Scaffold this active site. Structure first.
Site, mmCIF file in Angstrom:
data_model
loop_
_atom_site.group_PDB
_atom_site.id
_atom_site.type_symbol
_atom_site.label_atom_id
_atom_site.label_comp_id
_atom_site.label_asym_id
_atom_site.label_seq_id
_atom_site.Cartn_x
_atom_site.Cartn_y
_atom_site.Cartn_z
ATOM 1 N N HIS A 5 0.871 -1.168 0.000
ATOM 2 C CA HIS A 5 0.000 0.000 0.000
ATOM 3 C C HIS A 5 0.905 1.213 0.000
ATOM 4 O O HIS A 5 2.030 1.148 0.552
ATOM 5 C CB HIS A 5 -0.831 0.063 1.285
ATOM 6 C CG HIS A 5 -2.046 -0.813 1.287
ATOM 7 N ND1 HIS A 5 -1.972 -2.188 1.314
ATOM 8 C CD2 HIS A 5 -3.362 -0.508 1.314
ATOM 9 C CE1 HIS A 5 -3.192 -2.693 1.324
ATOM 10 N NE2 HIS A 5 -4.054 -1.695 1.328
ATOM 11 N N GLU A 52 -5.671 -0.932 -6.900
ATOM 12 C CA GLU A 52 -6.623 -0.108 -6.179
ATOM 13 C C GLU A 52 -6.419 1.371 -6.513
ATOM 14 O O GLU A 52 -5.315 1.897 -6.363
ATOM 15 C CB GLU A 52 -6.480 -0.317 -4.652
ATOM 16 C CG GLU A 52 -6.781 -1.748 -4.145
ATOM 17 C CD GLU A 52 -5.558 -2.682 -4.193
ATOM 18 O OE1 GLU A 52 -4.414 -2.200 -3.998
ATOM 19 O OE2 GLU A 52 -5.742 -3.904 -4.440
ATOM 20 N N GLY A 57 -10.217 -12.395 -6.814
ATOM 21 C CA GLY A 57 -11.516 -12.483 -6.153
ATOM 22 C C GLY A 57 -12.624 -12.965 -7.079
ATOM 23 O O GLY A 57 -13.780 -13.096 -6.660
ATOM 24 N N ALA A 106 -12.385 -14.844 -13.636
ATOM 25 C CA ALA A 106 -11.549 -14.365 -14.752
ATOM 26 C C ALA A 106 -10.052 -14.334 -14.482
ATOM 27 O O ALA A 106 -9.228 -14.829 -15.297
ATOM 28 C CB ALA A 106 -12.012 -12.991 -15.223
ATOM 29 N N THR A 135 -8.591 -14.605 -0.685
ATOM 30 C CA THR A 135 -8.835 -14.328 0.727
ATOM 31 C C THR A 135 -10.107 -15.035 1.160
ATOM 32 O O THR A 135 -11.005 -15.236 0.346
ATOM 33 C CB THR A 135 -8.905 -12.805 1.029
ATOM 34 O OG1 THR A 135 -10.017 -12.226 0.356
ATOM 35 C CG2 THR A 135 -7.605 -12.064 0.567
ATOM 36 N N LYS A 180 -15.611 -15.374 2.380
ATOM 37 C CA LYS A 180 -16.521 -14.765 1.403
ATOM 38 C C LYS A 180 -17.623 -15.655 0.857
ATOM 39 O O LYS A 180 -18.264 -15.277 -0.123
ATOM 40 C CB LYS A 180 -15.774 -14.088 0.246
ATOM 41 C CG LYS A 180 -15.097 -12.811 0.630
ATOM 42 C CD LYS A 180 -14.356 -12.157 -0.540
ATOM 43 C CE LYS A 180 -13.150 -12.969 -0.953
ATOM 44 N NZ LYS A 180 -12.339 -12.308 -1.991
#
Lengths: 332, 343
Positions: free
Chosen positions: A40, A107, A175, A178, A193, A196
């Site tokens: 980040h 992001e 996530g 694709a 992750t 979910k």
């Protein structure tokens, strides 16, 4: 490869640089096989963002066995992919057979903040940028001279003079189906992750990876299938629950996470989440048998590299509990 | 029983430091040589930052920021930095600002950011499109990038320059004391800028007395005065190009690796291809290359030529030895040279 590994998520979002390094050293001390960091430029209240590649190097130089890498870094916007190829090749020379590159599609928040102009590219372009950058980096890691002219990136007579013997394994985060499929086709590793919904893993992700591997005539078994397990295991239930609160942003929707370019906008929408809703993403548990049963599900679904992200500030407490209570069960 | 931090502020004594040449050594060797420099009494080690070596045959380029951090974790006293890094093209300056802030936290009061105007050899290779910008634009890019980093270092920052932008960007983890920025300078206009906006300047040996005494130093004084800052706040660093060996033939021949440094400033900053640089550089006979170097086989001649720079105002002497056997040079330095140089 697809032997069972247990690793540790070092959260750059939550800790200052020195603490972030020492926690990863404690993770080795406590028996983890690997440690991975978020990349980040910025996470605000109790927020941090130590430079991921400095974390990798400092921990590498201080450790003997941990596999180290990013989960994940965007090699497509603020970062020049040739420089990323050089950085990880160098790290690969410094810590033989212990480095990987974990990549994602990006992001807005990181990229707009560091000077990205014009509209934040739609998913399709972010994916095509990602595919093109990975091939560019791989050509560089051959150690030969590369001329590259893609839709997005370029090299003129470029070489990486210092390349590791085993190359730089690329782990591809997804996530959705694709990119999972792209991971199966092209990835040394795959990253997702937890938390979910059973459907995402068994119905979208795992079959996508197998599809990609099949499509490229690859053994599915040779791809390291990594997952960040969101676990809030503490014999004290108040802490197990309350520790999840810091991590509200993870409970925002996929598009808020990738596309909100304003950190004010982001903290507002994280702050809007009730703790009960945050917690759904997490394995909240005070019994070690029950915690491992929940984690064991992902191993049933086809995941083999399990990287534990614990939510609380007291990470040394997590590691103590991991070693005494979880790891013996997890190993089997 | 209270325990203090023990932390000594920047507040900089003749220093003797070591140039770690990324151009010449693989990643692990480059790290281990910085560790031996500490072992041999050095005060500092600096690494060149490059994507590609000057030369193809036996060329190397370990990532500078990984060298810095690895050496950080392995050393106790060394001041550590880049000499120099281009923060204007392949690198995003906001990312540089985050890297050095992080390193300055990891290694308190030991880190600096050394910056220069760029070489096409690093930037064209990594995908810079269009012609290689002229010195004026590269200088102006550098100045802006440094200003951006100052503002980013400490708060949420918007920045809107001719070259670089920030939008709501913050660096969370900044070191107490900040990040000293050292500017590479080979003329009075960059030396003036360095006094005004830097915490240090970096020059090299071999340019002649009046460069240092009459051009560089006076211009550093002018910039700092324009900044309302005492010039004694600017560290005065020089890369001393020294090929020292008791065998004079070997001390001369050991410069061949660094033939490219003997080409013109033009060629060095604008030639984009190590194969091309190398061909130009290797046509030159050894006596021409050796001209760039203090070549010495006696501790006394050595210390006489090196001591000139102290007389001209430099206080931070970073030694660049051209031979492959760096450990011999560290050994020779510590026993023969260091004691005379300290005083």
């Amino acid at each position: 490869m697809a032997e069972l590994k247990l690793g540790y998520k070092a959260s750059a979002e939550q800790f200052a640089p020195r603490e972030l390094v020492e926690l990863a050293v404690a993770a080795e001390a406590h028996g983890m096989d690997s440690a991975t960091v978020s990349d980040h430029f910025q996470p605000h209240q109790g927020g941090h963002a130590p430079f991921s590649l400095s974390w990798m190097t400092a921990v590498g130089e201080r450790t003997n066995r941990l596999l180290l890498g990013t989960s994940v870094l965007t090699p497509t916007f603020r970062y020049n992919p040739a420089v990323i190829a050089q950085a990880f090749a160098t790290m690969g020379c410094l810590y033989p057979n212990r480095v990987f590159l974990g990549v994602g599609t990006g992001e807005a928040l990181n990229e707009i903040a560091t000077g990205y102009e014009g509209a934040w590219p739609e998913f399709k372009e972010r994916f095509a940028r990602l595919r093109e950058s990975v091939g560019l980096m791989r050509q560089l890691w051959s150690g030969d001279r590369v001329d590259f002219d893609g839709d997005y990136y370029r090299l003129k007579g470029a070489s990486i003079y210092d390349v590791p013997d085993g190359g730089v394994p690329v782990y591809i985060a997804a996530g959705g189906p694709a990119v999972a499929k792209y991971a199966g086709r092209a990835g040394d590793g795959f990253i997702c992750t937890s938390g979910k919904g059973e459907e995402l893993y068994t119905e979208k992700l795992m079959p996508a990876v197998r599809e990609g591997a099949a499509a490229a005539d690859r053994s599915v078994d040779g791809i390291d299938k990594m997952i960040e397990i969101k676990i809030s295991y503490d014999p004290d239930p108040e802490l197990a629950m309350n520790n999840t609160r810091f991590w509200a942003p993870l409970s925002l929707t996929a598009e808020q996470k990738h596309s909100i370019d304003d950190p004010i906008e982001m903290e507002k929408a994280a702050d809007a989440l009730p703790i009960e809703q945050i917690a759904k993403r997490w394995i909240v548990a005070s019994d070690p048998d029950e915690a491992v049963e929940k984690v064991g599900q992902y191993v049933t679904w086809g995941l083999n590299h399990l990287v534990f992200h614990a939510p609380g500030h007291d990470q040394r407490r997590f590691l103590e509990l991991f070693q005494s209570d979880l790891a013996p069960r997890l190993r089997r």
